[PDB]
Design a protein around this nucleic acid. Structure first.
Lengths: 107, 571, 170, 362
RNA sequence: AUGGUAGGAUAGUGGCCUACCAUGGUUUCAACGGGUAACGGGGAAUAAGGGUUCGAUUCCGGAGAGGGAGCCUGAGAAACGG
């Protein structure tokens, strides 16, 4: 905003070299499987696939938003305007109902 | 008007509400000349009385900015002259549609006005709402009204007219006889309380209010109301505008008549009094003004009672006549008037002076009974049905200006009982049954049934010791109907009789159904009985009853046969 | 119009809905035939030519067993109190499989007096079911699937079956 | 036909009940063969009304106030059903996915219909067939629609009330509930006061434009055998009175003037209170009807006395009433439809112009 | 989307669907993505007793019965025989 430096998918000052590092971590799991033959190697998948996960917030997904068990704040494209709105449908002038809402007839 | 002439709107509804100084003769003449240039045939003049339509016609073709109006020496008043609008064989509209072609019409007519094409109506707020709807139908009608003036209504009646609509409306405020902003007229409007601001108040507008259980039905001194305090001025102007908005008519001297009446007092219903502040002026919930009657201290209740019967005890009794009782103009659904009527019944049953007079700190006179005299409105009958004011005296000749008959109601709101009210109600029940279609041909059948229920509730009311009616004897039934008519009724029980044959015996059957002899046998008191009362007592046709009952099939005929066959089983 | 078809799903990779067929007669995913308590109602449904499924729409009694002696009589239903896989199913009082439903097992008591002859403290059974023969509201599960059987079957809960389920009740 | 009252000289007539049979049950399979085998003057005297049969009838019945149509949800299979009083039969039948436990209609003549089932799918159904199916974050137990401000809202047992503001095609405004009781939802038709049936006899009230609640209420039985859920709420057309009805059979008629008590009446069985319907549109005002599982009772809201009562032979869980009538619908759990007419309550409608005639005298 | 268990549904295994859990699964050995009148492939099929490798045989890629929507009976079917 100050001009000292939006599609975030290409960011030059951000240095995420994850692309070859994920290839390197794919090169890790290829070489670690071939080197875990006798007893055990250094790190086959521990803190490598997890390091891919926590930087993308393991998956940044919610199970309730998946099933529709969470509310969706998106436009549902058929249901725009069949039950299209009306005129002032309040038969009172809505300021005496503000007195009714302030001073309730149950409270 | 030119825009309405250019538009193809069939419901060309033009509404003109103006204050003082409108120039209605020049305004209607300008509209008549515009309708002369771009109209089909003519303009149908509609007024409630002989108003200034002749002055409007004098301002249509002639009649420039110097009007020169006169009472009876004007050119329009004189008929034996040439007013220069003499028509001939030409296409001129000013000469043809002129004083020789004054299309004046009374607003009571609806079929002829519905057949008309272009009409103009003035002071339509004075007409009834169903009458205004019948007048301002789907034709091209221009409506002219005057707001907050002498012999006129208020803004609430204009708001009720606006609520009846929703159109093309406009407003005028500047005077034309004088100029707007005159301070002497402003002082005269302040002195006469001509300004209306009950709708402009922020707490006494509608049914949005506190609970009617916590209602402060306090009192106020007339001298305290007459005192020119600043708080007393705002409350009395709110009280006067409340009385102005409820009643249709508004006499300009009615405020001075209420102030100078020594035999009339008033009580003010108020909301729940907030003790957190306690000093700020609260807007009252309702205002009830009543007066006493008797031989102590304006005796319309006693004059009608003396006209109804010879009751010197009721003439000399302590009667109460409610001059006016109303809540806020849009607070009809609040029901606070019902609590105020309960408070008024409880009041009967137990520098300067102080401004706020306490309700408990007032000794009431030993009143014998209370009541009021109201028009025959369904809502007014509904308020009396929620109350105990049983109607007894009904005016046979309806008011020409109001368009409705006058109903006088009474209620014995005292521990002392007289039972003459119950006896007069039975006489009023017999009178109202006889007055059905004798003079009361054009009346609502449901409201007549509600009035009959009001008489029946007074029959079932207190002081019921030895006023119980008897049934019909065998000799009494023989004098009522012939044996051949009884055999005719058996044919009606066989359903071969038509509505004509059944309708002949319907007259004595209707009086029997109003009588207690048929009521002791059975009770057909559903909506079929209202059809039975409308056919017999109101003497309406079968098609007329079907349009009134909104069941235009033969079920109305079927309901009458079911009522007739019930009477056949009653033998 | 419900689908039981396998090609509607995504692949193991998550292939993007190849859209090969539309719905036919063979993959007819039928309606969920949820029942309730009340007077017994039976629907006969013809599938695959000669297979007659029995839809139980309303049901009032069941054949519930008691495993400690191996007997089952006919018991009038009262109402469900818990289901493992659902909670509003209980409030609906719709009896599916494995639902824990109350009964008034009076002929179980009548068999008990006709086989032993001793009152219930008003060869032996454990004490936690003596809490509710006095109440007369015994708990039972559902064994058979009622939607295709047209029958209600279950067993009375036994020993640890209470001690795990009133733990899940509270 | 029938003359069965509640011993109060209120001649209640019941048509198409379980006592009378289908007079045209099988014209080819049964009636052609049994015409000679049964003269059946009683069956020829049996008069079928509006000519359909509906087996395991509904958990939801509805009648549109305009167009003179009826709405029904079958449960032998999940059904949706259109009936036309101008044509006196099955206008239209269609299957659906699950059993519609709650339903609401658009304001005019069956054009658009909103359905709610055991699953969390809301069915917007237009003149065609099954226009769209949605998802609800919780399950479904209650839903209702306001034409003012263009918003249906749905709730079932939780914390967020899902306002389906159909304008701009989303759903918004998660209203904060208390202790997961919303088992009924109700509408104040003139001002939009919200209402929620809480399991601890609370009811909410919300300003929809301000998106905020204003108060809470409490319903306290004087006996109070058990804590109870209020099971239904309803607002009268005048905008003044409020109704409550709980699982203990206690119906409360709350006149809104800041009153702890009400007009309190208890049912004779107290299984539930299903629905509360006013009769302000017909004459003899202050009559109101509440329905249990096995009794529907019309009574005076001011006198506190029972006007009449209708006893069905099987349990019911819905009551529908065409305005301007003395006519009622039920959704029974059996193969016929209990529908009954009280002429003292009101006159018969236009399609039943002869039903008023045939049973008044017989 | 992957599994766990339970329930519904299915003729039936089944995340097919639902409920509540655990967060995972496929990949540099290429997951996902751009090209194909895929009238092109298929031993699908004898052959062509020499027409260079085929002149010829057939399977073949689907939807639908004016158009969406739902229903119906039959060991056959979401029928162009409702």
């Amino acid at each position: 905003a100050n001009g000292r430096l939006i599609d975030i998918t290409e960011n030059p000052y951000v240095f995420d070299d994850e692309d070859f590092y994920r290839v390197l971590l794919n090169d890790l799991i290829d070489k670690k499987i071939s080197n875990a033959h006798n007893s055990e190697s250094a790190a086959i998948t521990i803190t490598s696939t997890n390091a891919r996960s926590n930087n993308k917030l393991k998956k940044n997904i919610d199970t309730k938003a998946s099933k529709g068990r969470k509310l969706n704040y998106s436009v549902q494209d058929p249901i725009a305007n069949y039950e299209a709105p009306i005129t002032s449908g309040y038969k009172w002038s809505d300021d005496q109902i503000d007195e009714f809402f302030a001073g309730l007839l149950g409270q | 008007f030119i825009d309405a002439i250019s538009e193809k709107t069939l419901n060309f509804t033009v509404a003109l509400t103006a204050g003082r100084g409108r120039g209605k003769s020049a305004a209607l003449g300008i509209s008549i000349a515009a309708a002369v240039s771009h109209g089909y045939s003519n303009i149908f003049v509609t007024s409630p009385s002989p108003e200034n339509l002749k002055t409007l016609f004098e301002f249509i073709f002639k009649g420039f900015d110097a009007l020169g109006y006169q009472e009876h020496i004007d050119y329009d008043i004189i008929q034996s002259t040439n007013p220069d609008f003499n028509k001939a064989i030409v296409r001129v509209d000013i000469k043809r549609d002129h004083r020789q072609t004054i299309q004046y019409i009374v607003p009571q007519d609806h079929q002829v006005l519905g057949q008309a094409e272009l009409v103009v109506i003035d002071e339509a707020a004075a007409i009834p709402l169903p009458i205004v709807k019948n007048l301002l139908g789907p034709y091209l009608v221009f409506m002219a009204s005057t707001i907050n003036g002498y012999e006129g209504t208020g803004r609430s009646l204009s708001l009720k007219l606006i609520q009846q609509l929703r159109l093309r409306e406009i407003s005028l405020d500047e005077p034309i006889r004088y100029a707007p902003g005159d301070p002497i007229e402003k002082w005269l409007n302040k002195l006469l309380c001509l300004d209306v601001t009950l709708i402009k108040n922020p707490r006494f507008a509608t049914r949005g209010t506190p609970h009617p259980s916590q209602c402060n039905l306090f009192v106020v001194n007339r001298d305290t109301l007459f005192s020119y305090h600043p708080v007393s001025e705002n409350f009395l102007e709110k009280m006067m505008a409340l009385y102005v908005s409820s009643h249709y008519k508004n006499s300009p001297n009615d405020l001075q008549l209420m102030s100078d009446a020594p035999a009339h007092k008033l009580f003010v219903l108020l909301p729940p009094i907030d003790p957190k502040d306690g000093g700020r002026i609260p807007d009252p919930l309702c205002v009830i003004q009543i007066a006493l009657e008797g031989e102590i201290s304006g005796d319309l209740i006693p004059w009608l009672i003396s006209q109804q019967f010879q009751d010197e005890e009721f003439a000399s009794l302590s009667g109460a006549r409610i001059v006016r009782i109303a809540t806020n103009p849009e607070y009809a659904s609040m029901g606070y008037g019902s609590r105020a009527i309960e408070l008024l019944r409880d009041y009967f049953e137990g520098t300067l002076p102080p401004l706020l007079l306490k309700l408990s700190e007032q000794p009431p006179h030993y009143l014998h009974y209370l009541g009021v005299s109201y028009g025959l409105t369904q809502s007014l009958h509904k308020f009396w049905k929620n109350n105990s004011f049983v109607p007894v005296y009904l005016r046979q000749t309806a008011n020409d200006l109001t368009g409705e008959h006058t109903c006088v109601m009474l209620n014995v709101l005292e521990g002392r009982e007289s039972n003459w009210l119950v006896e007069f109600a039975k006489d009023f029940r017999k009178r109202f049954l006889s007055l059905l279609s004798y003079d009361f041909h054009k009346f609502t059948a449901v409201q007549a049934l509600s009035v009959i229920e009001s008489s029946k509730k007074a029959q079932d009311l207190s002081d019921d010791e030895k006023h119980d009616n008897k049934e019909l004897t065998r000799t009494h039934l023989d004098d009522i109907f012939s044996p051949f008519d009884l055999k005719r009724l058996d044919s009606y029980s066989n359903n071969l009789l038509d509505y004509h044959v059944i309708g002949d015996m319907i007259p004595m059957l209707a009086l029997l159904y109003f009588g207690d002899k048929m009521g002791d046998s059975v009770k057909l008191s559903s909506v079929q009985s209202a059809i039975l009362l409308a056919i017999g007592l109101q003497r309406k046709n079968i098609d007329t009853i079907a349009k009134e009952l909104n069941l235009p099939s033969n079920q109305t005929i079927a309901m009458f046969a079911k009522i007739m066959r019930k009477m056949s089983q009653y033998f | 119009g419900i689908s039981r078809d396998s090609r509607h799903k995504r692949s193991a990779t998550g292939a993007k809905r190849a859209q090969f067929r539309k719905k036919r007669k063979f993959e007819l995913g039928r309606q969920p035939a949820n029942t309730k308590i009340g007077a017994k109602r039976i629907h006969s449904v013809r599938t695959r030519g000669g297979n007659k499924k029995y839809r139980a729409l309303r049901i009032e009694t069941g054949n519930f067993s008691w495993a400690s002696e191996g007997i089952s009589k006919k018991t009038r239903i009262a109402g469900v109190v818990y289901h493992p896989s659902n909670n509003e199913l209980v409030r609906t009082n719709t009896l599916t499989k494995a639902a824990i439903v109350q009964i008034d097992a009076t002929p179980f008591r009548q068999w008990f007096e006709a086989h032993y002859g001793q009152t219930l403290g008003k060869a032996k059974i454990e004490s936690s079911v003596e809490s509710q023969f006095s109440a007369g509201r015994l708990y039972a599960c559902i064994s058979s699937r009622p939607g295709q059987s047209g029958r209600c079957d279950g067993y009375i809960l036994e020993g640890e079956e209470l001690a795990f389920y009133l733990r899940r009740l509270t | 036909v029938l003359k069965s009252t509640s011993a109060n000289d209120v001649s209640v007539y019941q048509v198409s009940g379980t006592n009378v049979s289908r007079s045209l049950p099988d014209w080819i399979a049964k009636k052609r063969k049994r015409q000679l085998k049964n003269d059946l003057e009683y069956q020829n005297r049996v008069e079928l009304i509006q000519d359909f049969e509906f087996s395991e009838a509904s958990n939801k019945i509805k009648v549109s106030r305009d167009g003179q149509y009826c709405m029904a949800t079958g449960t032998y299979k999940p059904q949706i059903h259109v009936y036309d009083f101008a044509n006196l039969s099955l206008k239209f039948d269609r299957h659906t996915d699950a059993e519609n436990v709650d339903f609401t209609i658009l304001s005019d003549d069956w054009t658009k219909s909103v359905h709610l089932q055991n699953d969390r799918s809301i069915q917007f159904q237009n003149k065609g067939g099954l226009h769209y199916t949605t998802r609800i974050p919780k399950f479904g137990r209650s839903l209702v629609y306001n034409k003012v401000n263009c918003d249906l809202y749905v709730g079932a047992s939780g914390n967020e009330l899902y306002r389906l503001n159909l304008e701009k095609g989303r759903f918004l405004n998660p209203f904060k509930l208390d202790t997961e009781g919303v088992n009924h939802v109700s509408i104040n038709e003139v001002n939009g006061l919200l209402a929620a049936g809480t399991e601890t006899n609370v009811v909410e009230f919300w300003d929809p434009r301000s998106r905020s609640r204003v108060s809470k209420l409490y319903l306290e039985n004087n006996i109070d055998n058990r804590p109870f859920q209020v099971t239904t709420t309803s607002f009268r057309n005048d905008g003044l009175t409020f109704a409550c009805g709980t699982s203990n059979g206690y119906s409360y008629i709350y006149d809104l003037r800041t009153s702890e008590p009400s007009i309190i009446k208890d049912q004779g069985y107290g299984f539930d209170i299903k629905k509360i319907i006013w009769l302000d549109n017909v004459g003899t005002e202050n009559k109101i009807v509440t329905c249990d599982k096995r009794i529907a009772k019309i009574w005076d809201r001011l006198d506190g006395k029972a006007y009449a009562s209708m006893e069905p032979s099987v349990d019911i869980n819905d009551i529908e009433h065409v305005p301007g009538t003395g006519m009622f619908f039920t959704a029974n759990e059996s193969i016929p439809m209990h529908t009954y007419y009280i002429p003292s309550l009101g006159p018969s409608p236009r399609w039943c112009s002869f039903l008023d005639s045939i049973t008044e005298e017989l």
